[PDB]
């Protein structure tokens, strides 16, 4: 029962991991294939806190120019944003100001998190020292990795604390309702059986 909804616009260069970051929160998966986002894809993310469930409607925008779609048209009535770049690609960090400029042009003083993704990669190109844009604009910065989940919840915890005005806000265990005993559909029984056989021949991702 979400107490509040917030529109969150996720922006950044193509390939920086925006869609992978959102899918990780949505389903827990790590999608390895890069399929460019076409325009935007909107996904809800609910987090339970000591002050109730909080829903973020995440507008995952396209980073590729050719697939931009509405571009800044997606930002209308946005209450917060995440700017993502890749710490293994200096050009993605070089364009962070342009993304920030486009955001503030439409939304002005909304809370914004700057995220340097793919810190799991050894050959890091954008060193922690070279990241100074958050200081020049008063943004919150986090190193993150959607592959290793390093700090992958910090951007939402911080945005939540800023939007709710509660410095002590914490994520808490969502209620785990005891499930009912369901009898499985005998009609789809043969389908469940085939899926299990194929699954037993396929190995886990890592």
């Amino acid at each position: 029962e979400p107490q509040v909804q917030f529109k969150l616009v996720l922006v950044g260069d193509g390939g920086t991991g925006k869609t992978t970051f959102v899918k990780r929160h949505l389903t827990g998966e790590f999608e390895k294939k890069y399929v460019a986002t076409l325009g935007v894809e909107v996904h809800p993310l609910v987090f339970h806190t000591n002050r109730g469930p909080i829903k973020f409607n995440v507008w995952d925008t396209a980073g590729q120019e050719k697939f931009g779609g509405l571009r800044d048209g997606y930002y209308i009535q946005a209450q917060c944003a995440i700017i993502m770049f890749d710490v293994t690609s200096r050009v993605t960090y070089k364009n962070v100001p342009n993304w920030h400029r486009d955001l503030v042009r439409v939304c002005e003083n909304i809370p914004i998190v700057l995220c340097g993704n793919k810190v799991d990669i050894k050959d890091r190109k954008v060193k922690a020292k070279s990241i100074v844009f958050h200081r020049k604009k008063n943004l919150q910065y986090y190193d993150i990795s959607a592959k290793s989940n390093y700090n992958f919840e910090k951007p939402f915890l911080w945005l939540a604390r800023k939007l709710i005005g509660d410095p002590n806000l914490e994520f808490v265990a969502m209620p785990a309702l005891a499930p009912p005993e369901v009898v499985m559909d005998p009609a789809l029984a043969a389908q469940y059986e085939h899926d299990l056989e194929v699954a037993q021949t396929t190995a886990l991702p890592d």
Binding site: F152, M174, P175, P179, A199, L204
Partner: protein, 138 residues
Amino acid sequence: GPGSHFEPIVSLPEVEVKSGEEDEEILFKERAKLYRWDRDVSQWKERGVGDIKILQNYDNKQVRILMRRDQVFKVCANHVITKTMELKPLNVSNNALVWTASDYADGEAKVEQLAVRFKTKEVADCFKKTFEECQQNL
């Protein structure tokens, strides 16, 4: 910029959130990586990483599996253990077990093929033992 300025803030009241586990006994609690089979692309997809629990209700003796993700604490597995479930090794991976369940992690029942991977073979063997001990006591 620096200095005074107005921001829209939504104030919320404190709430006592119950985990739903208060009336259950922990029979098993170990770290694990859970996977879910996606039949549309024929892949095992990571489903969550955290502590997977075998819980038993004190009063009605019902046994279920429950797991929560790290850092976000969201449910990635929630289903009762039945006598018809078959917990088998995943031969093509190491220290992995597979079984089918009607899961409620996302708020509604979905039949899913799940795979759980533990740190050691020893922990995996202890999970399979506790799992099958609950089945025999059904």
